[PDB]
Every structure is written in C-alpha cells, then in structure tokens.
Ligand SMILES: OC[C@H]1O[C@@H]2O[C@H]3[C@H](O)[C@@H](O)[C@@H](O[C@H]4[C@H](O)[C@@H](O)[C@@H](O[C@H]5[C@H](O)[C@@H](O)[C@@H](O[C@H]6[C@H](O)[C@@H](O)[C@@H](O[C@H]7[C@H](O)[C@@H](O)[C@@H](O[C@H]1[C@H](O)[C@H]2O)O[C@@H]7CO)O[C@@H]6CO)O[C@@H]5CO)O[C@@H]4CO)O[C@@H]3CO
C-alpha cells in the first residue's frame with residue numbers, strides 16, 4: 144500500500160475549518176502560522192485549537208473565506224513546507240449538501256448524434272470519461288466542472304455499444320469507476336455501456352392495483368424457480384423461463400408461468416435482479432447467490448441472461464419476462480437493496496465522492512448496522528436523489544409494479560416518503576413494503592423507516608414478524624413453537640394477526656392499517672417452515688407436519704392484511720435443514736418440481752384457500768375500522784381459535800362466515816353462536832365439493848381448519 148509522499152497532512156473537515164496534522168518528529172519544524180494557497184489565493188489560517196495525537200500534532204485551523212472545491216489547494220507551514228489540501232469530513236455536512244445538491248440528470252444522456260456524460264464529484268479536482276469498444280479505438284476525454292460540483296463532457300458521434308468508465312481525481316489520486324447511473328454494463332459489471340433506447344413496447348396495460356390487502360405475494364429467485372431438471376422450462380435459471388407458457392413437469396403437473404398463474408397469486412416478488420456480485424457470469428453454474436451484493440443499481444444482473452456478454456440482451460429478456468407476466472395478468476415486485484453496497488471501498492459511490500454515501504459512527508469509521516460492512520447514508524441529499532432516481536427508473540424503464548425494500552429500517556423516513564411520492568405518481572397502485580427491523584445504524588430512532596414508525600409512513604407496508612413467530616414459533620430458537628405447532632401461548636397474538644395486527648384489546652397495534660401488514664410464515668431467510676417445524680417437532684410424522692404447515696397457510700391466507708407466500712411453501716419446500724442458504728448450491732436452493740408433483744393435493748389446498756380469499760371480500764376489509772365492524776373472535780383456546788365475519792350485507796356474497804383453526808390431533812365439538820343451518824365448506828380433510836349442511840354444533844377432527852358459511 145504505497146502512497147504520495149507528503150511533508151504533513153491537511154484536511155477540510157468543514158466548510159471553513161482545515162485540520163492540519165504534523166508528524167510528531169516535525170512538530171518543532173513544520174509550525175504556524177499556516178496559510179491556504181491557490182491560483183491567486185493565499186490567505187491566513189487562525190488556530191482555534193491544537194493538541195497531540197498518537198504520532199502527530201494536530202491544529203484545528205479556521206479560514207475567513209469558505210473553501211472552494213474543484214481546485215487544488217496548498218497549505219503552507221511557517222517552515223516553508225507544503226501539502227495538498229485533502230478532503231475531510233466536510234462532505235457529510237448539511238452546508239456541503241446544500242451547496243452542491245444537483246437536481247438534474249446524471250449518467251450517460253444518449254442521442255444518436257452525441258452523448259452527454261455527467262457525474263457528481265464536488266470534492267474532486269478533475270474528472271474524465273474513458274471510452275472503449277470491442278476491437279475499436281479507445282479514447283479518454285477530460286470533463287469540465289459545471290455548477291453543483293457536476294462534471295460533464297459531450298462527445299459527438301453515435302456512442303451506442305461504447306463502454307465507458309469515469310476517472311475521478313480526489314485528494315490527488317485518480318480512481319477508475321463505473322457510472323453509478325450505468326443502465327447497461329459489460330459481463331460481470333466491469334464497465335458501463337452506452338445503449339440507445341431499445342424501443343421496448345409494453346403490450347399488456349394493467350390497471351392500477353386495487354388495494355394491498357387484495358394482493359397475494361409469491362417470493363421467488365430466478366435461479367431457484369426453474370433450475371430443477373424436471374422444471375419443464377427450457378431457459379433454466381434465466382429471465383426467459385417465466386415467459387414459457389403451458390409448461391409442465393415430467394409427470395404432467397403444471398409448472399413455471401402456468402403454475403404461478405394457476406396458484407392464483409397476483410404479484411411475483413423477485414429476489415435482486417440489479418447487477419450483483421457473487422456469481423461469475425462467465426461460469427454461472429460454479430456458484431450461487433441470492434444477489435444481496437449490489438454492484439450496479441441501474442442495470443440488470445447478468446447471470447440470468449442467455450448471453451451476459453451482450454450489454455443489451457439482459458435488458459431485453461428481463462423486460463420480456465415482465466411484459467409476459469403482465470400479459471398473463473401477473474404483476475412484478477422488485478427486491479431492492481438500498482441499505483448497502485458490495486465492498487464499500489471499491490464502490491462507484493466511494494470512488495466518486497469519498498465518505499459521502501456511507502454513514503459513519505462518532506469515531507469517523509463506516510457504520511455497520513446492516514451487518515454486512517456498510518450502511519448507505521440515504522439521508523444525504525444526493526443519496527436520497529439516487530434511491531428515488533433508481534426507483535422511478537425501474538418503474539419507467541422496466542414497468543414493474545412495486546418494491547420490497549431489503550432492510551427498510553436502514554433508510555430514513557424522509558427519503559422513503561420522498562420516493563413514495565415520486566413512485567406512486569409514476570405508477571399508481573404499486574406495492575411498497577419492506578423489513579422495518581430496528582437496526583443499529585447512526586440515525587435518531589424517529590427517523591428510521593422502521594416498523595415502530597409505521598404511523599408516519601402511510602402507504603408503506605412491513606413484514607409482520609409478530610404474526611410470523613406467533614404462528615410458526617420464534618425463528619431464532621429451533622425448538623420454539625407457535626400456535627400452528629401446538630403452542631397455546633401464542634393463540635392471542637395469532638388472533639390479533641388474523642384481525643390485521645391493527646390493535647386487539649390489550650395488545651398494542653403492530654401497524655395502523657391492515658394494508659401495511661405483510662402477513663407470512665416463510666421467506667428466503669431462515670429455515671423454511673417445513674425445516675423449522677421439523678426441528679421443533681422431531682417426533683411428529685410427516686402427515687401431521689403437513690397438516691400443521693397447511694394450517695399455517697390457512698391462518699395467513701384467511702387473515703386481514705396482505706398475504707405473502709414463499710415459493711415452494713405450498714409444497715413444504717425443504718432446504719435440507721440449511722438456515723441461511725444465501726450461497727448454498729442449487730441442490731439446496733432449487734425449487735423442487737418433483738416435490739410439487741408429490742404434494743399436488745396440498746398445493747391444491749393452498750390454491751383453494753387463495754380462490755376463497757379472492758371470491759370473498761370479507762377476508763379483505765380495507766381498514767381497521769371496517770374490521771372492528773365485521774370481524775369478531777368467538778373462541779380462543781390453546782389449540783382452538785374460532786372467529787367470524789358478520790354484517791356482510793353489501794360486502795360479501797355470504798351473510799355470515801365462521802372460521803375455526805385447530806392445532807391438535809384430537810377431536811372436539813364446537814357450538815355455533817346460533818341454531819341456523821350452515822354449510823360446511825371445509826374441514827381438516829380439505830374443501831368439500833358439495834357443502835353439506837350442519838346445525839348448532841360441528842366436529843373439529845384433528846389438525847386443520849373448518850370453514851362454515853351462510854348464504855343470503
Ligand atoms: O445478526 C445475526 C443473526 O443473523 C441472522 O438473522 C437475521 C434474519 O435472517 C433476518 O430475518 C433479520 O431478523 C429480524 C427478525 O425477522 C425480526 O423479527 C427481529 O428479530 C427479533 C426477534 O423476533 C425476537 O425474538 C428477538 O430475537 C432474539 C432471539 O430470540 C435470540 O435467540 C437471540 O438471537 C440470536 C440468534 O440466536 C443468533 O443466531 C444470532 O442471530 C443471527 C440469526 O441466527 C441469523 O439467521 O444472534 C442473535 C442475537 O440477537 O437474540 C435475539 C435478540 O435479542 O429479537 C429480535 C431483534 O429484533 O429483528 C431481526 C433483525 O434484527 O435479521 C437477522 C439479523 O441478521
């Protein structure tokens with residue numbers, strides 16, 4: 144780790160304060176008065192304070208005129224020595240932000256005639272764009288500094304297909320980096336690429352989605368979803384797999400697009416499709432990764448494309464996949480990672496404006512609330528601009544229908560509300576939700592976009608961890624059990640979740656409205672419900688485990704709120720006991736289409752539960768007030784919960800609906816709240832083809848759900 148030889152050090156830690164560090168053994172030589180020099184500049188520096196450090200003597204100096212960025216500055220000691228004025232913590236100040244905030248567009252602005260290149264590098268002193276092209280002439284042009292610390296250069300000619308990089312000079316060190324706003328990149332994202340608009344046409348217009356509680360989210364990874372040999376899809380592990388119609392397994396069961404459509408899901412949530420690190424796009428089968436290692440936020444991941452070498456190909460295919468899903472009435476949700484980047488030190492952010500895009504602790508070191516190395520400082524104005532810019536771009540360029548914010552809690556509320564405004568204006572009805580876990584990131588608690596602040600973020604949903612653990616059992620204790628696994632201690636919390644988690648008697652609200660409660664019992668994180676239950680219930684047979692998992696599904700799917708289903712959950716997806724499969728092999732992560740065949744009947748139960756929810760608005764009340772007015776608990780025991788939806792005049796096709804969840808293998812009788820004859824729609828055996836009529840009482844045999852309804 145070599146470096147530029149310097150007499151001593153000097154940094155701009157604030158708009159008008161320069162910190163001078165002098166090596167210990169030079170303390171009596173390199174001494175005050177110090178002066179700031181530049182072009183015509185040469186002013187005095189007042190010493191506000193001075194004190195010794197481990198191996199240096201420090202001076203906190205003050206300048207009369209605020210430092211002017213973009214020009215190389217020199218600080219001179221009385222001894223005559225000099226050093227270049229480097230960048231300090233000044234970059235993270237509100238004053239710096241307000242002085243250089245730029246509201247225009249950044250990146251490569253293409254025209255067949257010419258391309259304008261723009262990059263925000265306020266603390267830099269020089270910048271250039273580096274152009275290269277497969278077997279063609281490479282050229283590097285100096286860029287000019289305009290207002291708001293923006294560097295630009297216009298290159299005449301058609302730059303389509305041209306690769307580009309930015310060279311940014313900070314603290315006299317030039318760094319090469321990919322444009323933060325790169326909309327196309329080379330294999331493995333080594334360089335950005337300029338491409339003319341692909342003229343993609345969206346031919347499947349969708350009306351704005353009605354309301355969150357009307358959705359059914361299906362979480363899937365593009366590789367997992369079709370990589371299995373028996374998947375029935377040609378483009379295994381690629382964007383195009385989901386475009387294949389009427390595919391089926393070897394035995395003839397539905398698979399792929401046809402399958403997802405058949406299940407009745409409304410939104411397909413995809414794990415990260417922006418370019419990420421972790422899979423060598425040159426040898427994709429050699430490694431696996433969920434994709435939570437952000438490299439380029441504005442470009443698609445290359446391992447999911449048929450050809451990662453051709454810049455345009457991945458864009459074409461992701462857009463086709465999305466358009467096709469839309470043709471078949473399916474919407475798309477993008478998992479986005481604006482809480483951190485892969486390898487902060489070599490990131491486009493850090494190489495362009497050192498120390499600006501990442502939060503630091505009170506000691507000046509990069510914070511690590513995300514737990515993976517760095518926290519993007521969303522509150523910095525150009526960061527907020529970036530996240531908002533990115534969200535609107537994926538909506539406009541890729542026509543998606545919503546976003547799942549990975550570690551939403553790391554983002555600040557103002558940024559979230561700022562992007563929400565722009566996002567909903569660009570696409571009414573889109574879903575916006577995420578994991579608002581409270582994390583140790585340097586932000587006042589009321590500013591975190593966490594669950595605890597849900598009241599200030601209307602229109603934003605949160606994964607309901609309370610409802611999740613209430614049903615399944617604590618996810619951080621293998622043996623911990625939930626209601627569905629037989630623990631009566633969580634029955635009340637479960638009832639609360641069934642009511643939308645917007646307040647239940649002595650229980651404080653989890654979220655203000657049900658549209659903000661993302662209800663689920665499984666996701667890509669942690670053990671699958673099946674493996675979790677398997678650890679907590681070591682002595683239970685497969686048949687009973689299956690009834691319990693189907694039971695958890697009924698609870699979630701018949702609960703007020705927004706149902707969320709992990710891909711494969713419908714058929715007891717197992718990961719061989721692996722808790723965190725972020726980099727595990729395909730044998731571990733693949734969607735097992737063989738298992739989907741084996742348990743096609745169970746899958747069918749989930750399908751009927753979804754159809755039930757869709758056919759009856761009683762399960763989809765839009766407000767905590769309506770719920771308070773149509774939902775009531777009739778029984779709450781350790782293994783038995785019964786609730787009913789009433790006064791469904793012009794709400795539901797049915798007059799009254801009773802749902803009973805039983806979490807024990809024994810048999811029991813349950814008295815209805817009246818003597819009117821009801822229809823037995825479902826029981827532990829599953830939905831009944833021709834609903835028989837029962838009266839006053841009903842048998843609840845074993846683990847499962849019994850549904851009764853009264854037509855009007
Ligand atoms: O950080 C190490 C941690 O990493 C992995 O867990 C991830 C997880 O995959 C993410 O989903 C997310 O989790 C969220 C939860 O979803 C959310 O509910 C909440 O979690 C709270 C729990 O609900 C609550 O019960 C309690 O958890 C206790 C827990 O019962 C204790 O057992 C103990 O947990 C320790 C784990 O046993 C240990 O493995 C490790 O955790 C790993 C985890 O295994 C891995 O899958 O360390 C923890 C130490 O805390 O203590 C906790 C807390 O007292 O409280 C939590 C806190 O809200 O929030 C989390 C995120 O904070 O993120 C985790 C973290 O990476």
Ligand SMILES: [Ca+2]
Nearest residue numbers: 418419420445
């Ligand atoms: Ca990649």
